[PDB]
């Protein structure tokens with residue numbers, strides 16, 4: 001088994017597929033996990049989502065690499081055998097956007113915050129092909145998110161990065177905090193190199209208020225948790241202000 005240095009371990013309910021791990025979270029939602037083997041450190045796990053919406057599939061976040069992302073597409077083909085309509089990527093960092101080329105080669109429409117697309121070159125990423133824009137209260141402008149089905153995109157404010165976005169899964173009790181949210185037992189807020197330490201706490205709380213009835217909080221670097229992930233993240237961030 002892959003025992004990452006950072007990120008959750010493999011537990012019962014997990015399926016190893018190639019270099020990745022998949023975990024079913026709901027009848028129509030799965031978590032993908034991929035690993036970056038860092039020099040002198042070991043593997044760092046990162047999570048995204050796969051959502052079935054009738055006769056199509058929707059993806060949230062790439063894996064760290066193009067090859068790993070192609071493996072996600074192979075898993076979908078094997079296990080679901082439905083086409084991927086679109087992918088939403090949650091900010092311009094390698095764990096979320098490192099595999100854009102694999103999505104594009106597959107002909108999948110990609111979406112990111114306009115700011116993520118603007119930052120992508122400096123961050124060493126390939127931009128998504130479509131830009132999401134947001135209202136003053138953080139909700140996505142619906143005309144920029146056409147045919148998103150159950151994906152409800154929310155920009156909570158600057159936190160882990162200035163561009164980080166979040167996604168609620170309508171028709172479920174799941175919401176995805178990406179890298180903004182850390183689990184309820186987290187020791188740190190992770191890599192703060194690109195973070196907005198002033199606004200982080202309010203952004204974390206804004207994500208909780210946007211999806212007030214989501215009981216299963218999915219995040220990039222821990223297993224799914226309760227709403228205490230939101231509260232605990234915000235309390236850690238209160239110390240940065």
Ligand SMILES: OCc1ccc(-c2cccc(O)c2-c2nnn[nH]2)cc1
Nearest residue numbers: 006044093160179188189190191221
């Ligand atoms: O404390 C656990 C932990 C520590 C570091 C990361 C991380 C690693 C590389 C790039 C990164 O952007 C990150 C990162 N993502 N979210 N927060 N830090 C992730 C999780």
Ligand SMILES: [Ca+2]
Nearest residue numbers: 066098100101
């Ligand atoms: Ca690439």
Ligand SMILES: [Zn+2]
Nearest residue numbers: 091093160179
């Ligand atoms: Zn990041």
Ligand SMILES: [Zn+2]
Nearest residue numbers: 095179220221
């Ligand atoms: Zn991350």
